[PDB]
Structure formats: structure tokens, C-alpha cells
């Protein structure tokens, strides 16, 4: 981290990204809907997008795409490789600026 926030909700992440973030700000947090797992909260166009991270026990990924041994390697990969996450239509979801 410090893009990793161990004790926030999706709501609390929204509030943080909206008040202390800029467009391209992001963080990872524990998932509500999958206990024990993680979710990326990403600000783009003044709003927040959430994306689940899968942990299979053998790797992490985004329920698709490249496989990683650790959450930090996942985050680094998508920070370094811009334009790998997209809406189907067709703007990019960029992890630009960790929110620490």
C-alpha cells in the first residue's frame, strides 16, 4: 500500500475518493459482498467505480485478464499498463493515483 485501506466500506471509500481524491484516484479495500476478499474503488469523471478482485488461493485477477501472485503485483500491473480496463463503450478505467 498505502493504496490499501483495510477498514473501509464501499460507501466510506466513495466519500474518501470524492472529498480527498481527483479523477484517476483509487484504493483497494475489503469486499462486503465477498468476506475475506478485495475490491478496487476507482474515481473517474467525478464518480466512483467499484471492481472486485478475485483471490482463487492460487492467484489474484479481476475475474479475467492477467493472473498475479499478490494483490500488490496486480495493482502495480494496472498502474503501469494503462488502458487495460475499459467500459464496453469505450473509455478507460485508469488506476492513476493511489489514495493513501
Amino acid at each position: 500500500r498505502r493504496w490499501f485501506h483495510p477498514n473501509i466500506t464501499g460507501v466510506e471509500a466513495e466519500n474518501l475518493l470524492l472529498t480527498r481524491g481527483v479523477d484517476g484516484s483509487f484504493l483497494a479495500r475489503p469486499s462486503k459482498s465477498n468476506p475475506g476478499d478485495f475490491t478496487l474503488s476507482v474515481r473517474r469523471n467525478g464518480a466512483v467505480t467499484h471492481i472486485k478482485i478475485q483471490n482463487t488461493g492460487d492467484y489474484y485477477d479481476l475475474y479475467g485478464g492477467e493472473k498475479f501472485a499478490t494483490l500488490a503485483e496486480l495493482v502495480q500491473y494496472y498502474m503501469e499498463h494503462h488502458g487495460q480496463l475499459k467500459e464496453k463503450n469505450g473509455d478507460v478505467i485508469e488506476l492513476k493515483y493511489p489514495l493513501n
Partner: peptide, 7 residues
């Protein structure tokens, strides 16, 4: 909260 999910 709005989730995005892969295609």
C-alpha cells in the same frame, strides 16, 4: 455503490 463486472 456501482460495481462494474467483466464481459
Amino acid at each position: 455503490v456501482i460495481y462494474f463486472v467483466p464481459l
